[PDB]
Design an enzyme around this catalytic site. Structure first.
Site, PDB file in Angstrom:
ATOM      1  N   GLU A  82       0.819  -1.204   0.000  1.00 59.07           N
ATOM      2  CA  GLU A  82       0.000   0.000   0.000  1.00 59.07           C
ATOM      3  C   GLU A  82       0.858   1.261   0.000  1.00 59.07           C
ATOM      4  O   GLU A  82       0.354   2.378   0.213  1.00 59.07           O
ATOM      5  CB  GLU A  82      -1.012   0.010   1.155  1.00 59.07           C
ATOM      6  CG  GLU A  82      -0.395  -0.042   2.511  1.00 59.07           C
ATOM      7  CD  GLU A  82      -1.421  -0.262   3.578  1.00 59.07           C
ATOM      8  OE1 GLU A  82      -2.212   0.669   3.857  1.00 59.07           O
ATOM      9  OE2 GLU A  82      -1.418  -1.364   4.153  1.00 59.07           O
ATOM     10  N   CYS A 116      -3.963  -3.271   3.540  1.00 59.87           N
ATOM     11  CA  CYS A 116      -3.098  -4.389   3.955  1.00 59.87           C
ATOM     12  C   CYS A 116      -3.434  -5.749   3.276  1.00 59.87           C
ATOM     13  O   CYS A 116      -2.825  -6.775   3.604  1.00 59.87           O
ATOM     14  CB  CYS A 116      -3.123  -4.524   5.482  1.00 59.87           C
ATOM     15  SG  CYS A 116      -2.716  -2.928   6.278  1.00 59.87           S
ATOM     16  N   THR A 158       2.934   2.234  16.220  1.00 58.83           N
ATOM     17  CA  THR A 158       2.406   1.148  15.411  1.00 58.83           C
ATOM     18  C   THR A 158       2.990   1.123  13.996  1.00 58.83           C
ATOM     19  O   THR A 158       2.277   0.730  13.079  1.00 58.83           O
ATOM     20  CB  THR A 158       0.871   1.255  15.213  1.00 58.83           C
ATOM     21  OG1 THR A 158       0.587   2.487  14.534  1.00 58.83           O
ATOM     22  CG2 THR A 158       0.113   1.207  16.561  1.00 58.83           C
ATOM     23  N   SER A 208     -14.123   1.618  12.358  1.00 58.82           N
ATOM     24  CA  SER A 208     -13.050   0.684  12.052  1.00 58.82           C
ATOM     25  C   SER A 208     -13.134  -0.597  12.891  1.00 58.82           C
ATOM     26  O   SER A 208     -12.948  -1.682  12.357  1.00 58.82           O
ATOM     27  CB  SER A 208     -11.678   1.349  12.187  1.00 58.82           C
ATOM     28  OG  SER A 208     -11.241   1.223  13.514  1.00 58.82           O
ATOM     29  N   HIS A 246      -3.443 -11.230  10.119  1.00 58.94           N
ATOM     30  CA  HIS A 246      -2.942  -9.894   9.852  1.00 58.94           C
ATOM     31  C   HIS A 246      -2.599  -9.294  11.209  1.00 58.94           C
ATOM     32  O   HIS A 246      -3.438  -9.294  12.137  1.00 58.94           O
ATOM     33  CB  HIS A 246      -4.080  -9.121   9.196  1.00 58.94           C
ATOM     34  CG  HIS A 246      -3.869  -7.647   9.143  1.00 58.94           C
ATOM     35  ND1 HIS A 246      -2.746  -7.074   8.573  1.00 58.94           N
ATOM     36  CD2 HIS A 246      -4.670  -6.622   9.520  1.00 58.94           C
ATOM     37  CE1 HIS A 246      -2.857  -5.760   8.622  1.00 58.94           C
ATOM     38  NE2 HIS A 246      -4.021  -5.460   9.174  1.00 58.94           N
ATOM     39  N   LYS A 255      -7.245 -10.188  20.275  1.00 56.28           N
ATOM     40  CA  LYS A 255      -8.681  -9.933  20.146  1.00 56.28           C
ATOM     41  C   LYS A 255      -9.346 -10.718  19.009  1.00 56.28           C
ATOM     42  O   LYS A 255     -10.488 -11.160  19.146  1.00 56.28           O
ATOM     43  CB  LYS A 255      -8.972  -8.426  19.998  1.00 56.28           C
ATOM     44  CG  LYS A 255      -8.747  -7.636  21.308  1.00 56.28           C
ATOM     45  CD  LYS A 255      -8.999  -6.138  21.172  1.00 56.28           C
ATOM     46  CE  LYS A 255      -8.832  -5.492  22.583  1.00 56.28           C
ATOM     47  NZ  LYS A 255      -9.128  -4.041  22.590  1.00 56.28           N
ATOM     48  N   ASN A 325       4.327  -3.266  12.531  1.00 59.37           N
ATOM     49  CA  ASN A 325       3.368  -3.358  11.471  1.00 59.37           C
ATOM     50  C   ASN A 325       4.016  -3.427  10.104  1.00 59.37           C
ATOM     51  O   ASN A 325       4.712  -2.501   9.661  1.00 59.37           O
ATOM     52  CB  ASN A 325       2.407  -2.183  11.552  1.00 59.37           C
ATOM     53  CG  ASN A 325       1.173  -2.368  10.708  1.00 59.37           C
ATOM     54  OD1 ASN A 325       0.985  -3.383  10.015  1.00 59.37           O
ATOM     55  ND2 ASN A 325       0.309  -1.384  10.765  1.00 59.37           N
ATOM     56  N   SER A 358      -8.271  -2.428   5.290  1.00 61.38           N
ATOM     57  CA  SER A 358      -9.290  -1.405   5.483  1.00 61.38           C
ATOM     58  C   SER A 358      -9.951  -0.962   4.164  1.00 61.38           C
ATOM     59  O   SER A 358      -9.298  -0.936   3.110  1.00 61.38           O
ATOM     60  CB  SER A 358      -8.643  -0.194   6.149  1.00 61.38           C
ATOM     61  OG  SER A 358      -8.225  -0.533   7.467  1.00 61.38           O
TER      62      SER A 358
END
Length: 450
Positions: A82, A116, A158, A208, A246, A255, A325, A358
């Site tokens: 990206e 991503c 990040t 998001s 990812h 999570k 990241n 995203s």
């Protein structure tokens, strides 16, 4: 073409890094905000001498070299990224220099893009190319490459950078279970980059989280449905050996896996025991909409998933926690972590992969890993990638010198007519590493080596 999948992989990340603990202290941040709250230990970053092109050069040349692949034997080359270098000219075209020298210009593929997810899209196109009527019997080669660290603001911790190269072909140690997948794609404005002149995104934090969880649930549901048709039984977390995600930061990985246990709860799946049922029951009255914003649900899902996480997920976290990241390469670095850590026990196992970008585009797909002879074997892949070695050979920056470097990178972004400064940095790069020498007055970029 049988058993198509990943034959070989290599990975590059910049040796220059900053420890998250030190960055916490440098920033005004309470201890463990980054190392615990993000779950991140270290952040690799490109200095002025490194970019997506140079990192791709390292990864591809290392792959070609260590697996002893004839560059004439590449029939398709595709890039996921990206990280925008030109609005017209693809990153794929830059990489073609690496094949021109062999006279191999008859090569399919361009760049794939959506946030991503671009590296996944490319990987799947390449697998489909191998299985297609147009296949000419040669290897596919997929590159995922990305670099971005925001110079200021709350998103700076990040960041990260890497390139991964993957060779694609029949008879693989890493085989796509072709029908066992599910995708979710939608028009959302959760995270996007609408201002062409800057690296700053528009972010809708509210949307998001709702978007990502909606995509994850939906991909899992679709994959489960496919599994039920394929194998005639309901899927649960127990039907895969490893789950790879990812991995922009490690807390999202925790999570994500936990959300899959909640899904299993909702489907009364067999991964959910007695005590787990009782833990989730207080949440059985929540609507789906409600389920995405409940902190209490998150924590119970987390408690439930805890033991399964250490067995199925934790070995996928090494590189993302130490590098940061990696955007399109993130999932593939988590996968590379898994091979590094578990190669001798991966033969026969099922690995589920979840890719997100995203905007939004997502796919959950399954792999079966297999014993195969070297050079295209799980053990030889782990050996070639030398993830242990690369991690030992890093060079730490003080948060100070890191922040100055990010300001520098901010200055060079979309800029022409400069020569990079090699003084103090080139010494840090490993022998054979490609680096940026200058960008001339027509934006043309020139690279050296070593």
């Amino acid at each position: 073409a049988k058993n198509v999948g990943i034959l070989a992989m290599d990975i590059y990340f910049p040796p220059t890094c900053v420890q998250q603990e030190a960055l916490e202290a440098h920033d005004g941040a309470s201890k463990g905000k980054y190392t615990i709250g993000l779950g991140q230990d270290c952040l690799a970053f490109c200095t002025e001498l490194e970019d997506v092109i140079s990192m791709s050069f390292n990864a591809v040349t290392s792959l070609l070299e260590k697996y002893k692949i004839d560059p004439k034997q590449i029939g398709r080359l595709e890039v996921g990224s990206e990280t925008v270098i030109d609005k017209s000219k693809s990153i794929k075209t830059f990489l073609m220099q690496l094949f021109e020298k062999c006279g191999n210009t008859d090569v399919e593929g361009v760049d794939s893009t959506n946030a991503c997810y671009g590296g996944t899209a490319a990987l799947l196109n390449c697998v489909n190319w191998v299985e297609s009527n147009s296949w000419d019997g040669r290897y596919g080669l997929v590159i995922c490459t990305d670099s971005a660290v925001y110079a200021e603001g709350p998103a700076r911790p990040t960041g990260g950078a890497a390139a991964i190269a993957m060779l694609i072909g029949p008879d693989a140690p890493i085989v796509f279970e072709s029908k066992l997948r599910g995708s979710h794609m939608a028009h959302v404005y959760d995270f996007y980059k609408p201002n062409l002149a800057s690296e700053y995104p528009v972010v809708d934090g509210k949307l998001s989280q709702t978007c990502y969880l909606m995509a994850l649930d939906s991909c899992y549901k679709h994959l489960c449905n496919k599994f039920e048709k394929l194998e005639g039984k309901e899927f649960s977390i127990n039907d895969a050996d490893y789950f790879v995600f990812h991995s922009p930061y490690n807390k999202l990985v925790q999570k994500s896996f936990a959300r899959l246990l909640y899904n299993d709860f909702l489907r009364n799946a067999s991964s959910i025991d007695e005590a787990a049922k009782e833990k989730f029951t207080p949440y059985s009255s929540l609507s789906l909409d409600e389920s995405y914003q409940s902190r209490d649900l998150e924590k119970v899902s987390q408690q439930l998933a805890k033991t399964y996480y250490d067995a199925k997920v934790q070995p996928t976290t090494l590189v993302p926690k130490q590098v940061g990241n990696m955007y399109t390469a993130s999932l593939y670095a988590a996968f590379a972590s898994l091979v590094h850590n578990k190669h001798s026990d991966l033969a026969g196992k099922r690995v589920v992969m979840f890719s997100y970008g995203s905007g939004s585009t997502a796919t959950m797909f399954s792999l079966r890993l297999c014993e195969n002879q070297s050079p295209f074997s799980l053990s030889n892949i782990a050996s070639v990638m030398d993830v242990g070695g690369k991690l030992k050979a890093r060079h730490e920056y003080a948060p100070e010198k890191f922040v100055e470097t990010m300001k520098l990178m901010e200055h060079r972004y979309g800029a022409k007519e400069f020569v990079t400064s090699k003084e103090g940095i080139l010494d840090l790069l490993a022998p054979g590493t490609y680096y940026l020498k200058e960008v001339d007055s027509l934006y043309r970029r020139f690279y050296g080596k070593k």
